[PDB]
Amino acid sequence: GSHMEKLAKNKVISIDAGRKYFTLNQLKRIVDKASELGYSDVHLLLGNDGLRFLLDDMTITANGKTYASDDVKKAIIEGTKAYYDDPNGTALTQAEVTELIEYAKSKDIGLIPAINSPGHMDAMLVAMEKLGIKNPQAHFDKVSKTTMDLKNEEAMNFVKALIGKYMDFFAGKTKIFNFGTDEYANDATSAQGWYYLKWYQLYGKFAEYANTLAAMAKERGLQPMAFNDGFYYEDKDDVQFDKDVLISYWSKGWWGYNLASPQYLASKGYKFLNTNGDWYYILGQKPEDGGGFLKKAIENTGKTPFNQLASTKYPEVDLPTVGSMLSIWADRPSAEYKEEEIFELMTAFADHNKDYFRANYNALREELAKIPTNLEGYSKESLEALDAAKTALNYNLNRNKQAELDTLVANLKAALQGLKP
Template structure:
């Protein structure tokens, strides 16, 4: 295939897919690109199973409502995302893919056997990420540890790891169990490697350490000195993310708990998802303290929290979430006494009771209300319907147009940038106008006259003097109409056929008879000795010409004279 043919084919394919060359950009961090705060919707798909369709519905609404990101908790008590390869090697021991998968799935069932599904597959997540990228939505994956690990702890036990949980906790790994920690890190590394180059932020959770037992909690860790191991653990996860080119994020409650810095320094590249100011006996560091330590703050104000199934009540109900929209600013960080710099804000829906029914209409309505309330921070996307309509007018058969006009069309397609906001609607409409003009400006290629020219060349090589009538050929050539475009190729082909047919129908002039030419008589054959003829009554034929007998007669005469002379000479000698 010619280079030009390949180019045209690719351009046509792009149009058929509803995009054009250059329209699709890789996932980006919108806040960094647009210099505005991130607006994140978070969904707890760790405790409760969410299907691909449900996640895509949320992503669609996030796009139309002006969110920049959707955070998906995949590991939160349960672990509801299975990679294709879950095999692990820990401390020299290999756990096979099937063994790890079966153990984790069993852990999910032990936590909550969700009738809607157990876990997303890697193909499912590939689809979700692709769907989000096409709508300029960043995905923030969350796999929580060292707390909220119920299913993973069950899996470790089934795989033969002894006592992985902290002091009777059902959901928190023991930081003093080196094998359990190594297993957890190896598992997390699998997920970090998968999300590398697919997302920008990876959330490791790291909240509520062993809050389900009296011996747990951050204060107990600090009392026993184990908090130092927590600092090292979080820093190790942060480094894991950074090595993959990702930004690490954790929830705030365990970071510099009670403003204590004597156990070590947390990685300064951490993003702290600040959700709670704490409560009696739960003394978390204030947002100002964390900001002064150089940590970035993602405002995850729990005033906006809704726990599925709680439509009313005082704790994380639908009512309280809606009420908080009226009382809180987008930048209000829990317990902040002053303005704290943030990189964005998060609205979250949780599934503390995974059996609670998902009310998708209510969830989407809550997203709409959040977007409407904070519209100054969440500009809606520009309307690309005119662009899409213009794209639909691009002809499918682009190979019939000239290179110059195709180049102009391609330039307009490449100029389209998706993901612009409503305040740039005029620019987006300009894309549509440019595409429409380029389509109207497409110029058809000229028809192919090569067969016509070849037929005419054949006719010119013929000597018309040899043919009875050359008029049909002349008429066919005279009927050729130049300047037709490629859509009239059949007419041009017919012209070539007409000339070729006329040439084939030519008749040669008859050849005139030649005048007879005089002939020279053939010489008579020389006499030869012949056998005696049986027909004795027939006379031998006489020679036909003198030329044939003269030499013989002369020889005979000479012989006779010589004999007579010799006889005469002898007689005289005798006398």
């Protein structure tokens, strides 16, 4: 409602760097563009099908043994390559992600990492086989290639420990950690995972897994995030979930795929990051394919309100959100990533919501850096003018006031150009 509240909401661009590889530089250009358009965060899937992030030390202790760091890396590379051997690269390094966090911090952009499980973990599944964990995959109408078997303790201990090490790295570097939990063995159930889980009475074990991951996150000072799919499926509460989880809500599903309504989750106390399916772009999707092609995503940045949760009509239904997230996915990871399409889409979201997005502070930052470090040998006339310009700076401006901001920075330049001994 207020100027302050709107700017305090999260405005997030999501990048699926799990299915598909992105260079440090491509990610830095995304954060750049995120900063310029007044976003607050970049949500970066690192484990999503492919596992595209390796820590310097990947030693894992589970199952009463330890798996050598070198073995863990080699296995993961193999797992990720088997999902998709991307010719542009395999995994980002620790040094790369650390630099991306520092860089994003310098531009007032948070990073929100995601490592997906128990679904979307093709690469982890293969890696576990290579490390001597047999049959880690869930098994329904056929053996899953995507999802871990909830009954396999050996696989479960390994993954939990692996997610731990990832969370240890992000602790004190990022505020939020997304553990995902979307799509339970959809490839093995004709996209009816949750129905299969309830049918087999494994849904309770699903919640246990999810609740464990939320507690792990919290223990290490990370806000846990997850997608909506798995929580209180079909609005039933026979099986309980951690209430502290930030729910990234993208859709209520479709016929026979009966996700909890956002009304039901709100009534359970959840906060949402509005990740509306309407805003999805899948790299390379064409009009003729239906779903999230670029021109529909761009049109929806106007048509679907900022605060509208999927399946609800806003403002008739008005549920509290912490902010909204626009998502770029790489379902066919060999599709070409075309920066400008993403930029055009980010820009369109920001342009239709100028009251939510910050102005562009990059020019201001450039100018503040041109301030001399000592500045003790200049006149008092020169410095009074620089004091007054520095004081008149406004960091609270939204995207409707670029001009108002540019003037302020112009005066800072003039005062800096105005100094003299």
